[PDB]
Design an enzyme around this catalytic site. Structure first.
Site, PDB file in Angstrom:
ATOM      1  N   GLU A 264       0.899  -1.163   0.000  1.00 40.10           N
ATOM      2  CA  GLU A 264       0.000   0.000   0.000  1.00 40.10           C
ATOM      3  C   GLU A 264       0.923   1.194   0.000  1.00 40.10           C
ATOM      4  OE1 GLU A 264      -2.323   1.164   3.644  1.00 40.10           O
ATOM      5  OE2 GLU A 264      -1.198   2.915   2.903  1.00 40.10           O
ATOM      6  N   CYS A 301      -2.729   7.558   5.360  1.00 42.63           N
ATOM      7  CA  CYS A 301      -2.614   7.253   3.929  1.00 42.63           C
ATOM      8  C   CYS A 301      -3.908   7.672   3.174  1.00 42.63           C
ATOM      9  CB  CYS A 301      -2.337   5.760   3.722  1.00 42.63           C
ATOM     10  SG  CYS A 301      -0.848   5.322   4.657  1.00 42.63           S
TER      11      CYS A 301
END
Lengths: 504, 500
Positions: A264, A301
């Site tokens: 990720e 994020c």
């Protein structure tokens, strides 16, 4: 006074080990500690042990693994006080954050435990024998998911519990039946240690093979490389930067026997605020946005770095509302000095574009960050790729567009994202419908009337998105479906009942 | 059937960079358009454009399209068998049987997507009552990844080719497909493309849902897997070609997954009670599986592992006497026949291997061969464990169940591994199964690996170097997962949800 003083050692298959000298932690407050430095030998040791553990742990029952995940969760909770203390020291995140993220971590362990006990994830299937079939008989075939093997986990810096030592990737891999070798993040080694102590305690109590879990502290770049190239490592879960993630992905693809890399990476997480919602709720929307931008010093994020609006009065209402709320936010300590510096460097790349006008500029100093807001038009944004750059930290960009058509144009031009969000009222439906099929293909999670900062740990979650948001090629890193990253199905044909694996 | 020789690019039959000639085993050669980069670009642009309609298709719509393809293929049965047997040299019976496999597979995917379970739909209800912050509703559904490239296999010119299992699964998921058609059966490619074209015209689906590009250089294949609009690749073929394409997919500015099935030796372990009781029928059954389709199966059992002794001698004699009766069979191409002769020599020129049946093949035909070696010699030479594509078997003699089990531990990843056993072999079988299940996608007991059933439960694939699937199957309904990506939808109004 310290509830917890770290050993500062590696945990390699039940043994606490020293390394090639030591490195000091760099906490925001509290005392620095010395930690063992990792080496390629220590990687080799951990991965050999993970291989040896797999012959028993890869073959354990679901009930046994559920017991083990519940035991880890119970041990982490027994360490609540030491986790909050060292965790807040190292990261600069408030105590309330560490306490809440601990609850996320233990609940996520327990959700995987429940999930494997249900057994649906095994994908069990059977096609009966047909001896009568012509011109050739069919033999019975059964299918079941099986764990892939030892897995490497690179913990995230910004979620030092729920995306780290015993966080989402570790939890999914253990639930599958994969031993885990964790490359501990240099930014929170004491926080990685107390959680490794919890896992160690759970391993002694349950009787699982100690090679089921290792933690290696402070690798040089060769140490992270050796880990993803190790012949016994069968998949990698990673959370980090684009450059760092893509380099490891390329190493996994270059191996003599390649393995899947599930990383990720970065997202801007754009939101599109439609004309009717903006007319009705601009102020509330601008404050909701400033809240999302600044949570954890911006260090999510899923932070929505960009808000896209059709120009005009309501945009101005929204933009003023955001500026106002942001002007009230005090500096927040960031995770590392290098991160605080990157944030300033980012802030400078905006302050110097003639293409961008600042709505709020603050001095950030040291390890702290204060918010920033900049504004630009769609044509100038479509003119300069660099304006869609993710800045890690509490900087926002308003992009004012001319029409739905231009807003769609932007939406088509975004690279893959973890998330994309639409803010809308019932009168925005037609526009939202033009946008949804474009945003569906750009992101793993499409949100309406919400902010993308909270990631629910639920069966339905997709946390991930098209490259360069992730290298997951569809997989999620959060939620119970993330267990698929660590399983492979095997077909068993004409096999006697007493030879079948227990999984059936 | 007389081929037009044209590419099919989004509903248009197009010329290429001149023509190349088919090389049939019997019948007339035909000239076919040479593929180019520009034609790749045109097909990929049209597939992207088609995605905005087809990718947003109902499952009912796509099932009807799959069934229409199958119907159009069955409407061309005689032509397919004609040109198919001509190009490949396989018997008409094989082309007939394989057409049934192909239509039945399309139909299976039509039935599968109508059930809807593959969409993985999940829902976590809102909790407005939760604090500190309430939880919004989240819903998950699988969505097609986008345009998919398919490289058809030389050795199954219908079921793993133009409208074969990768095309079927991609079309089922909602992905337009661009097919890089194998140069060994271009007219067989064309006739199945003419069936797909007819189904597209009958059903009204966007014509960029399917393209077939014939021949063309190594650069055509490269441009397809690197095309920015191609989002996944299905491939059946050699280790070398497949790893090369895999590497290109990983090196792209935006990487995409490459699903390549690459070859195996498919070892069998014949346990002592079984060999004692049924050595002869086992050697006979192996002989039939080795020689089927001139040995041209990715699942051909190239290696038999036995503990030395009188029963292993009985098994070996029986297999040799059965192989010795088998007539040469024509292979799919001159190049394959020549690579087979190379494989025979690979064995025949090594002193560590004893020839048992060593007949030379000529021209396009393949003669069965059999060799023998010991476990130690096998592990000492990697070449002895490499695939020979054609009807060659190797017997590997070990000294004990322990040594057998150590050999099993030594194998690279395979599509399949097989145990032949009788009830008294159970305890040895129990030590082998955990090893072989890590080495193979499919573990068989008492059968031969050659036939691959198209069922929900199939895993046709295996750990690298057998495939680059990282778990996925190429065959069976679960293969649809290669071409799907889940998306979560949070707090989304009923009115704005996708239709699935």
């Amino acid at each position: 006074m310290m509830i917890f003083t770290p050993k500062g050692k590696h945990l390699v298959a039940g043994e606490w080990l020293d390394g090639a000298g030591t490195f000091a932690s760099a906490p925001a407050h509290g005392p620095a500690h010395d930690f063992a430095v990792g080496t390629v030998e220590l990687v080799n040791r951990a991965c050999e042990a993970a291989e040896e553990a797999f012959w028993t742990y890869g073959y354990s029952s679901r009930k046994e693994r559920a017991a083990f995940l519940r035991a880890i969760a119970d041990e982490i909770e027994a360490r609540a006080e030491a986790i909050t203390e060292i965790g807040s020291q190292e990261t600069g995140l408030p105590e309330a954050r560490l306490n809440g993220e601990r609850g996320r971590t233990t609940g996520q362990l327990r959700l995987f435990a429940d999930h494997i006990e249900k057994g649906d994830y095994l994908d069990r299937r059977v096609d009966a024998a047909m001896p009568e079939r012509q011109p050739a008989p069919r033999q019975e075939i059964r299918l079941v998911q099986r764990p892939v093997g030892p897995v490497a986990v690179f913990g995230a810096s910004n979620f030092p519990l729920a995306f780290s030592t015993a966080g989402g990737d570790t939890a999914a891999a253990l639930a599958a039946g994969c031993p885990v070798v964790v490359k501990g993040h240099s930014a929170h080694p004491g926080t990685g240690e107390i959680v490794a102590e919890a896992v160690d305690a759970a391993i002694r109590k349950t009787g699982v093979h100690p090679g089921v879990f290792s933690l290696i502290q402070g690798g040089s770049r060769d140490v992270g490389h050796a880990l993803v190239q190790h012949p016994h490592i069968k998949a990698v879960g990673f959370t980090g930067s684009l450059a760092g993630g893509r380099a490891l992905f390329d190493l996994c693809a270059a191996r003599p026997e390649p393995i899947p890399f599930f990383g990720e990476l970065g997202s801007v997480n754009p939101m599109f605020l439609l004309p009717e919602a903006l007319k009705a709720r601009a102020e509330t929307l601008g404050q909701g946005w400033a809240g999302s931008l600044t949570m954890g010093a911006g260090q999510f994020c899923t932070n929505p770095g960009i808000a896209v609006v059709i120009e005009g009065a309501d945009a101005d209402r929204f933009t003023t509302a955001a500026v106002e709320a942001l002007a009230k936010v005090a500096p927040q300590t960031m995770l590392t000095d290098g991160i605080a510096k990157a944030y300033r460097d980012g802030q400078a790349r905006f302050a110097t574009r003639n293409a961008v006008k600042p709505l709020l500029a603050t001095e950030s100093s040291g390890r702290d960050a204060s918010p920033n807001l900049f504004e630009t038009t769609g044509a100038q944004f479509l003119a300069d790729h660099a304006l869609g750059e993710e800045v890690f930290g509490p900087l926002g960009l308003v992009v004012r567009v001319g029409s739905p058509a231009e807003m769609e144009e932007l939406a088509r031009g975004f690279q893959g994202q973890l998330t994309a969000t639409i803010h809308m009222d019932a009168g925005d439906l037609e526009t939202a419908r033009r946008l949804r099929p474009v945003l569906e293909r750009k992101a793993g999670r499409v949100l309406v009337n919400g902010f993308p900062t909270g990631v629910e740990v639920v069966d339905s979650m997709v946390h991930g998105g098209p490259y360069p948001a992730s290298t997951n090629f569809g997989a999620t890193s959060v939620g119970t479906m993330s267990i698929r990253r660590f399983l492979r199905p095997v077909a068993y044909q004409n096999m006697p009942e007493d030879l079948l694996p227990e999984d059936f």
